[PDB]
Design a binder for this molecule. Structure first.
Ligand SMILES: [Cu+2]
Length: 128
């Protein structure tokens, strides 16, 4: 079982994958996020946020309203299944979450909630 993935967010508003697969035999799954490039967090910050596909737009909008000091996430947002912190160039973060939080049939998305980034910086997350 492959229970982790390394993902990069760069200076050109790209993640280097748009589809993550979570083996359902994994008890926990880990996302290791890094940021190649040289732009700082306040202008090209990236996070990795997981929600249902239906909830993404709300999470992104409310995250915008929350601001940089809150890593562009609504505090205690019930729709956020898991998330990293917001990182700038040269920085990294990891998040580990319980695979039991994912339910058969539901559609999940990952994305960055930094203002303006989610249109490109998004992808699917799917049980196997
Ligand atoms: Cu971003």
């Amino acid at each position: 079982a492959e229970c982790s993935v390394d993902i990069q967010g760069n200076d050109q508003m790209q993640f280097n994958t748009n589809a993550i697969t979570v083996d359902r035999s994994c008890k926990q799954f880990t996302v290791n996020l890094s940021h190649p490039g040289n732009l700082p967090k306040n202008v090209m910050g990236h996070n990795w946020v997981l929600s249902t596909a239906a909830d993404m737009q709300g999470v992104v909008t409310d995250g915008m309203a929350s601001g940089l000091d809150k890593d562009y996430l609504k505090p205690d947002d019930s729709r956020v299944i898991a998330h990293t912190k917001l990182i700038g160039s040269g920085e990294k973060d990891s998040v580990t979450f319980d695979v039991s939080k994912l339910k058969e049939g539901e559609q999940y998305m990952f994305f960055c909630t930094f203002p303006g980034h989610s249109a490109l910086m998004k992808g699917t997350l799917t049980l196997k």
